[PDB]
Design a protein around this ligand. Structure first.
Ligand SMILES: N=C(N)N1CCC[C@@H](CNC(=O)C[C@H](NS(=O)(=O)c2ccc3ccccc3c2)C(=O)N(CC(=O)O)Cc2ccccc2)C1
Ligand SMILES: *[C@@H]1O[C@H](CO)[C@@H](O)[C@H](O)[C@H]1NC(C)=O
Ligand code: NA
Lengths: 11, 257, 30
């Protein structure tokens, strides 16, 4: 249930 | 954190979240000690029996957070890891002895009102403050109960939690557990006869046990949330890595690397 | 000299105290 973070950090 | 309460904004500016990339989940707490170094528990990263062995690429560090789940765009900073260092004589085989690990950030973080490092203790501070009956503070986004009813009970906190716990006499710590406890550990929590409660719980691990010095007004990290038997059980105590006893290793790693 | 640490911008640095730190300090004087 995390808000999504910039996908640059998730590769 | 069991039987704690909501933190105030900016009450623990050194609190770090260890975030797993995929799946997205909360791994452990940690603490900021300079602009490029983070301190946590070894067992958050490495435990061979459950084939647990995380890597610089497996994780994100999130600094400056209040909410457990929000992306706090204005306030938090997200960093990648350059390198992880685990104490070479970390004993995962029998008692989690030397449960400590350092993490070097890829880039330095800019401090702000919500991001600030905690002090590590010198010999004089450690000797004055680490005494049975004195209280420290634990913070984290870990569980609010050991166990709860699925899809009804709560659960996990929505903001950072805080509890204050007393340090306990070495003899009582020993008597309370069949585990071989070393001089790299201390235990804290209330005794059954005292009428207050409180403990760390799943997800609080790796986070800081801190104390405030009345003479210079500074906060010192004396411990790291390490292990315990359940959460907030009567006649049981949480065990913490003894940060001062292990300061020479910290000192070596930061100086050499 | 030594880098600043353990003084929170929104507390120590503005002379405000958090809700429960008084509990920590009193533990010292029993
Ligand atoms: N009450 C507390 N303050 N703590 C610290 C925060 C997590 C709490 C709940 N977590 C647990 O109750 C699970 C397990 N306990 S245990 O009694 O099974 C236990 C105790 C000591 C042990 C020493 C060596 C090997 C196994 C041991 C297992 C454990 O501590 N942890 C740590 C945790 O929850 O982070 C699980 C764990 C142990 C070792 C490696 C990975 C995970 C316990
Ligand atoms: C864990 O993984 C790292 C990097 O892949 C490796 O070098 C290390 O030996 C591993 N350790 C264990 C105990 O599996
Ligand atoms: Na207890």
């Amino acid at each position: 249930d995390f808000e999504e973070i910039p996908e640059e950090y998730l590769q | 954190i069991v039987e704690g309460s909501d933190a105030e904004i900016g009450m623990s500016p050194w609190q770090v979240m260890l975030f797993r990339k995929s799946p997205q989940e909360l791994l452990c707490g940690a603490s900021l000690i300079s602009d490029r170094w983070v301190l946590t528990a070894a067992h958050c990263l490495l435990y061979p029996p459950w084939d647990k062995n995380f890597t610089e690429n497996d994780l994100l560090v999130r600094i400056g957070k209040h909410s457990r789940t929000r992306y706090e765009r204005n306030i938090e900073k997200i960093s990648m890891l350059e390198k992880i260092y685990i104490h070479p004589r970390y004993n995962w085989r029998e008692n989690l002895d030397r449960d400590i690990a350092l993490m070097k950030l890829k880039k330095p973080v800019a401090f702000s009102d919500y991001i600030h490092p905690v002090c590590l203790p010198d010999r004089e501070t450690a000797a004055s403050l680490l005494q049975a009956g004195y209280k420290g503070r634990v913070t984290g986004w870990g569980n609010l109960k050991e166990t709860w009813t699925a899809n009804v009970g709560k659960g996990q906190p929505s903001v950072l939690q805080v509890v204050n716990l007393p340090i306990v006499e070495r003899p009582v710590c020993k008597d309370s557990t069949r585990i071989r406890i070393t001089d790299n550990m201390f235990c804290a929590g209330y005794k059954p006869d005292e009428g207050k409660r409180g403990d760390a719980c799943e997800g609080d691990s790796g986070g800081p046990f801190v104390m405030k010095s009345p003479f210079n007004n500074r906060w010192y990290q004396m411990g790291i949330v390490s292990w315990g038997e359940g959460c907030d059980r009567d006649g049981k105590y949480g065990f913490y890595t003894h940060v001062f006893r292990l300061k020479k290793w910290i000192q070596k790693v930061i100086d050499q690397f | 000299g030594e880098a600043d640490c353990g003084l929170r911008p929104l507390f120590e640095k503005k002379s405000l105290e958090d809700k429960t730190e008084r509990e920590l300090l009193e533990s010292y004087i029993d």
